[PDB]
Amino acid sequence: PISPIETVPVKLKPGMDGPKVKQWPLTEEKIKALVEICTEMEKEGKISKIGPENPYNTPVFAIKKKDSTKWRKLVDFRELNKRTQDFWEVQLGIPHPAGLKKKKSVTVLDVGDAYFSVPLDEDFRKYTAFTIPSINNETPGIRYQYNVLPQGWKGSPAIFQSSMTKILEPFKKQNPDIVIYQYMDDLYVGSDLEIGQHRTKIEELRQHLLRWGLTTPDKKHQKEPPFLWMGYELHPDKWTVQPIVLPEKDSWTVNDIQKLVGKLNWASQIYPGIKVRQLSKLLRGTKALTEVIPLTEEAELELAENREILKEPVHGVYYDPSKDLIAEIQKQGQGQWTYQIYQEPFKNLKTGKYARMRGAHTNDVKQLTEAVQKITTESIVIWGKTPKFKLPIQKETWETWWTEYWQATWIPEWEFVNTPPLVKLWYQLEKEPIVGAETFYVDGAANRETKLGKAGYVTNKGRQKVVPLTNTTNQKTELQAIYLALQDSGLEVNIVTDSQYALGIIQAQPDKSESELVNQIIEQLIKKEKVYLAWVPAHKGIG
Amino acid sequence: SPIETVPVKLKPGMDGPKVKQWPLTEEKIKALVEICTEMEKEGKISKIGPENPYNTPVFAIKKKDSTKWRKLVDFRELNKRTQDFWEVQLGIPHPAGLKKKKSVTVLDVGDAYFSVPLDEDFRKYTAFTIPSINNETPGIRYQYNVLPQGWKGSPAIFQSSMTKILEPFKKQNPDIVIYQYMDDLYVGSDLEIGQHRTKIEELRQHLLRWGLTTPDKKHQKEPPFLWMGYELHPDKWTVQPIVLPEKDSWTVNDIQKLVGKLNWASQIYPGIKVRQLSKLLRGTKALTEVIPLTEEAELELAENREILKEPVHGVYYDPSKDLIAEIQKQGQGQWTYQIYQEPFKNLKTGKYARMRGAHTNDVKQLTEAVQKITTESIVIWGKTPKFKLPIQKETWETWWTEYWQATWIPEWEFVNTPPLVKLWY
Ligand SMILES: N#Cc1ccc(Nc2nc(N)nc(Cc3c(Cl)ccc4[nH]ccc34)n2)cc1
Numbered sequence A: 001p002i003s004p005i006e007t008v009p010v011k012l013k014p015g016m017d018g019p020k021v022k023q024w025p026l027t028e029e030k031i032k033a034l035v036e037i038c039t040e041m042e043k044e045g046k047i048s049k050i051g052p053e054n055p056y057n058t059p060v061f062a063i064k065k066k067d068s069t070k071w072r073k074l075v076d077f078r079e080l081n082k083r084t085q086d087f088w089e090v091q092l093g094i095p096h097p098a099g100l101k102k103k104k105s106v107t108v109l110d111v112g113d114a115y116f117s118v119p120l121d122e123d124f125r126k127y128t129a130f131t132i133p134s135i136n137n138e139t140p141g142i143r144y145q146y147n148v149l150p151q152g153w154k155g156s157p158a159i160f161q162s163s164m165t166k167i168l169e170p171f172k173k174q175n176p177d178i179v180i181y182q183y184m185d186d187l188y189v190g191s192d193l194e195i196g197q198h199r200t201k202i203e204e205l206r207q208h209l210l211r212w213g214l215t216t217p218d219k220k221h222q223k224e225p226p227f228l229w230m231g232y233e234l235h236p237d238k239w240t241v242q243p244i245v246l247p248e249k250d251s252w253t254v255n256d257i258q259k260l261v262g263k264l265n266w267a268s269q270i271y272p273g274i275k276v277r278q279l280s281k282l283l284r285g286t287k288a289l290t291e292v293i294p295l296t297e298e299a300e301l302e303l304a305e306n307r308e309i310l311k312e313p314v315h316g317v318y319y320d321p322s323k324d325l326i327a328e329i330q331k332q333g334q335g336q337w338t339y340q341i342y343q344e345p346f347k348n349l350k351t352g353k354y355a356r357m358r359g360a361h362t363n364d365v366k367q368l369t370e371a372v373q374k375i376t377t378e379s380i381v382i383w384g385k386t387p388k389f390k391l392p393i394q395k396e397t398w399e400t401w402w403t404e405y406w407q408a409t410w411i412p413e414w415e416f417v418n419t420p421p422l423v424k425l426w427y428q429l430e431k432e433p434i435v436g437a438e439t440f441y442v443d444g445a446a447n448r449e450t451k452l453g454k455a456g457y458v459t460n461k462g463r464q465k466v467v468p469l470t471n472t473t474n475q476k477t478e479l480q481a482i483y484l485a486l487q488d489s490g491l492e493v494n495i496v497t498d499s500q501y502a503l504g505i506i507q508a509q510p511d512k513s514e515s516e517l518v519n520q521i522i523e524q525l526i527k528k529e530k531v532y533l534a535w536v537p538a539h540k541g542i543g
Numbered sequence B: 001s002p003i004e005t006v007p008v009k010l011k012p013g014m015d016g017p018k019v020k021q022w023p024l025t026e027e028k029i030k031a032l033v034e035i036c037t038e039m040e041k042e043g044k045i046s047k048i049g050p051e052n053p054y055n056t057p058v059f060a061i062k063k064k065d066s067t068k069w070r071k072l073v074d075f076r077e078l079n080k081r082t083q084d085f086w087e088v089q090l091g092i093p094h095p096a097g098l099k100k101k102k103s104v105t106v107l108d109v110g111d112a113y114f115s116v117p118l119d120e121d122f123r124k125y126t127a128f129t130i131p132s133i134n135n136e137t138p139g140i141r142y143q144y145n146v147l148p149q150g151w152k153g154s155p156a157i158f159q160s161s162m163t164k165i166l167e168p169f170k171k172q173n174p175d176i177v178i179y180q181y182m183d184d185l186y187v188g189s190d191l192e193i194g195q196h197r198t199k200i201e202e203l204r205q206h207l208l209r210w211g212l213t214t215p216d217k218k219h220q221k222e223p224p225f226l227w228m229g230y231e232l233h234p235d236k237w238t239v240q241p242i243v244l245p246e247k248d249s250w251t252v253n254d255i256q257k258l259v260g261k262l263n264w265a266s267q268i269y270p271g272i273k274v275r276q277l278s279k280l281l282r283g284t285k286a287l288t289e290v291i292p293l294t295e296e297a298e299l300e301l302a303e304n305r306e307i308l309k310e311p312v313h314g315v316y317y318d319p320s321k322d323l324i325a326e327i328q329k330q331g332q333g334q335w336t337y338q339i340y341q342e343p344f345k346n347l348k349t350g351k352y353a354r355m356r357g358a359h360t361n362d363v364k365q366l367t368e369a370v371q372k373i374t375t376e377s378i379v380i381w382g383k384t385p386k387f388k389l390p391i392q393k394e395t396w397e398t399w400w401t402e403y404w405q406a407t408w409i410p411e412w413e414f415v416n417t418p419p420l421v422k423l424w425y
Helices: A028-043 A122-127 A156-173 A195-211 A254-267 A277-281 A297-311 A364-382 A395-404 A474-488 A500-507 A516-527 B026-041 B076-080 B110-115 B122-126 B153-170 B193-208 B252-268 B275-281 B297-307 B362-381 B393-403
Strands: A105-107 A130-132 A142-144 A178-183 A186-191 A227-229 A232-235 A238-241 A326-331 A336-342 A350-355 A388-391 A414-416 A439-447 A452-459 A464-470 A492-497 A530-535 B045-047 B058-062 B069-073 B103-108 B128-130 B140-144 B177-181 B184-189 B324-331 B334-340 B348-353 B386-390 B411-415
Touching (some): A028 A130, A105 A195, A178 A195, A254 A277, A277 A297, A336 A364, A350 A364, A474 A500, A474 A516, B026 B058, B184 B193, B252 B275, B348 B362
Parallel strands (some): A326 A388
Antiparallel strands (some): A105 A186, A130 A142, A227 A232, A232 A238, B128 B140, B324 B334, B334 B348
16 A cells, blocks of 8 residues: 555575475365455455565464454464564563543554555565465466565564554654654554644544555544553553452462463552462462462451452543652562652552562561562652652651662652651661570480481570470571570570571561561571570681 | 774674663663664664574663763673674784783773674674663664674774774883773873873873774863772782781680681681681680680681791683672672682682762662772783672662773672672672
């Protein structure tokens, strides 16, 4: 449909040649079924009859719509694709609705017969060769070649979108009042011109397009909102996720829990407090696809609350550059955090969650910063600027943590927001030992094979305890020991540990881990008034 | 002024870079947009189509914070994919004594390259993309038409031109060592600073009246307290804070700690036995308890304070290997750092700090201790190290640019376990 359209020169991967995949014979009904689609096709110049020895062929296959209102031509370019150069990946990133700027009118455009409107590099034309059979050797097979973009080739979407961009560009510039967004075959136009003009301007666009062989049976701006796109319900001034369904089942299998978590994560964009720890905690699937897995107790409760949340429709608003971009986070609990980003008080821009990806240890302050981190990157992609954070932490707690933290961090501008839970250090270990405090030379190992060990201790004051454990590891006992030491000690204690392992676990001052031992030790640390763990080399170290 | 291009061929079985462009602030998109628009005019870069799948990243840094930004192309991937075969087919020899000069100043000559046209074929491999906020749009795409800054093939192909422009200067002044690493010239002299400074602007203007513009016009006769001559002093490069404390009294803990540090010195200097100190701890005594000494204990201390004050050997620089640069937060704007190639075979340890307080954050610091440690590397061994940055990847990945000033980018990774390797240093 276009000589005025400039073709994008295409090439075959470095040392390869054009596809050669002979055509299987098809039903005679189809031969003409294609012959109809093809002569009216060659007629439209989209394709062209080709003479002998274009050694390259590709499979054609008349396909029934299954609604049989008419027939459809379909080519299998798999082999051509496998032989054509890479192109500039389009849509590698997709816009988030929460980042679209508040606009009045927005009208989509089903730019129809698009791939067949854009020309195709003359030279790359010879590989598009496909042959339609003539009823079992009756003739030299009706053989065609493509002059437009083959509807299923590799560089088609790209070359299309490229070409489009070039076509709009003129018009696009003759109108900074209109902004346009291309999406494959779609073309969403938006503006702030009184709806009367905007409808007059789309008329224009449309005509502009039209002069470029690009048609749009979509006149009046046919299709209306809410627009369905990449799974979003997009209304004039609001947006949301295309309704989801969390099925209720008797037995849950892996492929089942996965689409569930997927649906749940996805709804998290705008549905506040959606948790997913438990539902996933299950998926440490030694990836057995239909391995039937029984929802655990919490997973059953977790999914519950998600329903309570999901049932009730929640929407998200758009972006007004002229207003701030605020972000708030609130701790759920089992390493889970949730956040919503907003400009106004009641309607959100978007929401989301964050959880410390499985690693048996971490602190709330650490977790909160990782959260803040993810939000920052999200903000930069969506709005192009960091937001103002409102966080459940007090300058004193925060700044005291980043100062003692060995890793470097960057805390953008934030405000305190008193609204529990509260992020805080439930205990600080003593930097220098404690004078007078009974030192506990805590120790405890095990027999790697026998899975048996003992954790005990010996203090200055000649106090010695030794407890036996069955079914634990050197690691397990090393904390078992420390713990022990805390139990027996008074409210101030000095503990000498031989294991960095035990050291670090506690030194990071983790505030949690479902690892009941550390919990016990942690709970004990909070109770004391002065604790000092000090590390000393193992083997050689002491006696 | 068309010049004959110099054919660039990547190592066989190597295809061009396809790295993804980091998302940017609208601010920076805005700047890059302006900058590229201008380069497009000057004809330096050109818009490209979809038949170009390649992409190296671009950022926007603040030159010398003035009204404008500079565009910074991270050609790290395209470099490995080339310059490594152009560290060969065009190697730029490294002066093993530039580290000896009393003063080294660094001037940005990168802008020279911009005249020399880029091999018509290799261009496609340089394509970069100005991103769009919230993807509402297809990145803006350009590819280079002239030698570009950041890509090591530029100093390699300009090398010809450079050694000539500098020849009738390297004469008058035959004692100054000039080294060209990428877009920067490292001039080294043994002059009293005052003269050096002059000698440099002597050079600054030499280049200038022959074409090469060098923005190293840091300031004017007005002192608003801006930071002085990128004058490094590699004759003062040294270090021995392998400092044990010389205390009045020694407690059970003190030694304990001590006996500890001394144990990791074990793979750095397999020379110090502690049985003599450590034996003074075979007991389960208090910790706050002060306990003077033992036998060769003091000898084991005064004797260790010695071998530890005398650097190790076998520690030689292998050019085949890479330089690995570990850093660490030390607290109160202090950061210690090692440069090695094999564990505990330090080629050079060190330290950095800014002025601690109400103006500097960690990232900016890190971002600095890195450009510091880097430069040092370049000066000493003509090659940047691979930094093992103690920081969360994403955080660093968002801000590094903020305080970044070098026209180059080392290679880095992120550690998340820095042991009390912080203690020992
Ligand atoms: N800032 C900004 C900004 C962002 C987008 C537009 N243009 C625009 N706004 C809306 N509300 N809908 C549309 C159409 C549109 C749909 Cl149907 C679905 C997902 C989308 N992503 C992308 C555009 C877009 N375009 C204009 C300005």
